[PDB]
Write a structure and sequence with these properties.
part of a larger assembly, 2 chains, A: mainly alpha, rod-shaped, B: mainly alpha, 0% strand, Multidrug resistance protein MexA (chain A), Outer membrane protein OprM (chain B)
Chain lengths: 52, 53
């Protein structure tokens, strides 16, 4: 009903997508903990043990 | 002649005044929609209501 402009709607949508991208980067930076196996196959030993 | 001048001008004045009231009523309705969705507070709604009054 044009209670706001169309322009600051586009500005709020831009800030929403930027904060979405920042949450996505924090989520992949937390997914870089608990280091996933990149490939499937056979695994050796652990050169770096617990606590190191 | 003054009565005829009043008849001639108050239709234009009163139609401009009804358009003033329609504009202020639509402004109050948009401020009420802006409040009910939640963007502005209740003080701006009361200010729009006093303008309509």
């Amino acid at each position: 009903d044009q209670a706001v402009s169309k322009q600051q709607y586009a500005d709020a949508n831009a800030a929403y997508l930027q904060s979405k991208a920042a949450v996505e980067q924090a989520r992949i930076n937390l997914r870089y903990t608990k280091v996933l196996s990149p490939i499937s196959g056979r695994i050796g030993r652990s050169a770096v043990t617990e606590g190191a | 002649a003054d009565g005829l001048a009043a008849r001639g001008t108050f239709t234009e004045q009163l139609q401009a005044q009804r358009d003033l009231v329609k504009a202020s009523d639509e402004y109050y309705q948009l401020a009420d929609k802006r409040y009910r969705t939640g963007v502005d507070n209740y003080l701006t709604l009361l200010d729009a209501q006093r303008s309509l009054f």
